[PDB]
A and B are shown apart, each in its own frame.
Chain A
């Protein structure tokens, strides 16, 4: 194959230079489990038992015993497949554009296949990370003109039936009000018996800079970050709390546990960018190639995510 498909050989040689996605830091190693499909739906069944009555004492002779019931719930996850196209130079035509310091036509913005594939893969990975964090797909910084997606396709920020708090516009700079809302959300969180688990928080850089301020008269040797860590430890049964900063978020705070039993990411094994065999070829030196990627696969329990939005209006 590599002796016939030069594009496949180039992709194999250049796949190493692609950097790992940043979404891996947001999840524990046990929370992510690859599945096998490209587009469609999958169903998961969870079985839970319950007790119907008080236990029975085993004394002398008895045949009437208490019973244990069972129940199940089924959750459907929708996936999607998307593709992008990019132009590049034909392999036989590269020798006529090679230069001492570079390869490609600067005046016409034409690149060798390896470089074009690497850049396109980087862009697609950035888009995948944005979708995973925010649950929406868009190329505008304004966030409008979004691509309408399928139901049962949610991200961490748009997951339904989760706890959402709103900090008012006038109190956007009041860290005490922000922490009041955070405490209310943490109180309204419901983790069941799996509460003894590590927790993860994602904040925007502005919120991080606000946090790194000394904790408020004023005090010292203690920061708002430490206060938040203690507050989260008050509910996670003194378990570890991690804090991360993502430029994708805007005046928003995400809090969620790192336990697989509550939140699990089961993405497709073809989610990451993959080259397509179809290569358009003409009489000219310009060729076209396609990259495919799969989106979807986030499963969460009800009322286990806290979403704090600070209104900047």
Chain B
């Protein structure tokens, strides 16, 4: 529920191996990042980290924010959060993205590379209609309720 674990660690890390050391929730951004990518920031409502974001409008006194969501209201993908400022970094749906995203905790075993994915109401990826997302790996469980998956989003489909 946080970019960095809230509880501290009682163990020093072991820097020997170099394989499978990237499947952590603190891994922000994308695995393959282009220097010509468009990056925005918005005020954050809730915790949309590693989730699809949609625009949220208040009464009018304050500016718009971004909240976890999908479906017809999908605006982009949140890849980072600055907690001190409450800032969510957003890559718009018109920009290609490749990285680890939160996956729905239902049928995660059935998720295999090459499977079409779509965002749900909570900004979570699920196996399939309107958004082109393809899973590049299998679901990795970081917590009893937290599952991530490597996926590429390349815009809306007809």
Residues of A within 8 A of B (CB): 85, 87, 106-109, 123, 126-127, 130, 138-142, 247, 280, 288
Contact = CB atoms under 8 A, between A and B. Distances in A.
Give the dominant DSSP class at A's interface.
loop
A126 B18 contact: yes
Given A107-B3, A107-B84, A109-B28, A85 B33 contact: yes
Given A85-B33, A126-B18, 17 more contacts: A106-B4, A107-B4, A107-B83, A107-B84, A108-B80, A127-B18, A130-B18, A139-B18, A139-B19, A139-B20, A139-B22, A140-B19, A140-B20, A141-B17, A142-B20, A247-B16, A280-B35
Given A85-B33, A107-B84, A288-B35, A141 B19 contact: yes
Given A107-B3, A107-B84, A141 B20 contact: yes
A109 B114 CA distance: 31
Return the 3 tightest CB-CB contacts between A and B, nearest first.
A141-B19, A126-B18, A141-B20
B4 to A, nearest CB: 6
B154 to A, nearest CB: 20
Contacts of A138: 19
Interface residues on B, range: 10 to 19
Contacts of B83: 107
Nearest to A288: B35
B82 interface: yes
A146 to B, nearest CB: 12
Nearest to B36: A280
Contacts of B26: 109
Give the dominant DSSP class at B's interface.
loop
A123 B18 contact: yes
13 contacts: A85-B33, A106-B4, A107-B83, A107-B84, A108-B28, A109-B28, A123-B18, A126-B18, A127-B18, A138-B19, A139-B18, A280-B35, A288-B35
A273 to B, nearest CB: 14
Nearest to B18: A126
A138 B20 CA distance: 10
A142 B20 CA distance: 9
Contacts of A127: 18
A284 B3 CA distance: 20
Contacts of A140: 19-20
A106 B20 CA distance: 22
A123 B19 CA distance: 10
A279 to B, nearest CB: 11
A24 B80 CA distance: 41
A9 to B, nearest CB: 23
Contacts of A139: 18-20, 22
Contacts of A109: 26, 28
A130 B16 CA distance: 13
A139 B83 CA distance: 31
Interface in B2-39: 3-4, 16-20, 22, 26, 28-29, 33, 35
A62 B28 CA distance: 86
